[PDB]
Structure formats: C-alpha cells, structure tokens
C-alpha cells in the first residue's frame with residue numbers, strides 16, 4: 001500500500017496473507033469458513049512451491065495468539081484467466097480445514113447484487129504490499145481509504161484506454177494506492193467486499209493510472225460453483 005497508514009491490529013478479521021514458501025506473496029480475503037478469495041496471477045509460476053494462508057495476522061513475523069497458518073487443499077483459478085490479461089483475475093483457495101473463527105478471524109460478507117459501486121464511494125483496501133518505490137515491505141498490515149472512480153473516466157485514453165470492462169472497477173490512485181504484494185486483497189465498501197485487487201503489473205500512486213479491482217458481484221455464480 002502506498003500513501004496509507006498502519007492498520008488497527010485485527011480490525012479486519014477477514015484479511016488473509018497468501019504465502020509461498022513461507023513468505024507473503026499476495027493478499028486474500030476469507031469469504032467462507034474454508035475459503036479464501038485472491039487473484040489468479042498470484043498462482044502463476046508457483047507450481048511445486050508451497051502455498052499457505054495466514055489468518056488472524058497483523059504482523060507477518062511476530063507471534064500473535066490469533067495467528068494461524070493454514071495449508072491449502074485446492075487452488076482454483078478462474079477458468080478464463082490468462083497470463084497476459086487482467087480479466088477474470090480471481091483465485092479460490094480451499095483451506096486444509098475450516099478456519100477457527102473468533103474476534104480476529106471471520107469471513108466478510110460479499111456483494112452478490114451485480115450493480116456498480118457509486119463513483120466517489122470511499123472504500124478500504126488493506127495489504128502487506130510494498131510501501132515505496134524502493135520496494136520496502138512492511139511487517140504489519142497497512143490500509144488506505146480510496147474513492148471509487150467512474151468507469152468512463154477510468155477508460156479514457158490517458159488512463160486505462162478501454163481496458164475496464166463491466167466486470168472491473170477503479171479507484172483513485174493519487175499518492176494513495178494499492179501496489180505490488182497487495183494483489184488479491186480486498187476492496188471493502190460499507191462493510192461489504194466489492195472488489196479484489198488485480199495482480200497485473202501497474203504503476204502505483206500515479207493519479208493517471210487508477211487502481212483496478214475485480215468486481216466480486218460479477219463472479220457470484222463462479223464463487224458459488226467452486227464452493228459447491
């Protein structure tokens with residue numbers, strides 16, 4: 001997260017760290033007792049490498065009573081995801097067992113009605129992604145409040161030049177933004193998950209290149225299908 005602040009420890013009990021070989025790789029969001037939603041490009045070239053999900057965390061390195069590392073039974077990328085596109089960039093991770101729920105570990109309600117979030121709505125994005133251009137990685141969860149940007153402005157030639165489909169949404173990226181390592185994490189509006197940070201390479205904190213998030217409401221039937 002660029003231009004954000006350290007999050008209040010355990011105030012976002014749905015926040016997951018998707019890990020590869022014991023290091024943070026991507027964000028994720030607990031959407032059911034046994035399921036974490038993240039981004040499909042996080043899984044790219046990770047074959048053989050061990051994927052785990054850390055729940056109940058604030059610090060990535062320090063012991064916390066609520067922290068628990070879960071192994072992954074199944075990793076299910078969206079079938080239409082492709083390495084060279086930002087489309088259908090979702091991944092469902094089935095934990096090895098149902099997560100132990102409590103005040104620091106709880107699934108987040110997610111949007112099932114396929115209607116756009118209104119432009120200007122203030123949404124929250126959290127993650128352990130880089131915090132500066134040098135690539136500094138924070139030990140503790142960071143977050144930033146970002147206003148939703150209307151799709152037509154986001155699609156302008158100077159911005160994302162038509163790449164923003166009805167299945168995607170944008171948020172302002174003026175000095176405050178998601179970045180590398182935040183991919184897969186949640187965009188929460190009014191206490192409901194609305195988007196998942198995309199995982200394609202993009203500049204961070206440049207107002208001319210808004211943040212891109214996959215609209216979960218646009219994938220409600222796929223999420224249901226995988227869990228069933």
Ligand SMILES: NC(=O)c1cc2cc(OCc3cccc(C(=O)O)c3)ccc2[nH]1
Pocket residue numbers: 178179180181182183197198199200201202203204
């Ligand atoms: N969600 C975002 O805003 C955002 C994602 C993102 C990803 C970025 O490169 C991640 C990457 C991809 C492939 C290989 C490596 C490697 O390890 O060599 C690293 C850079 C800026 C970024 N911004």
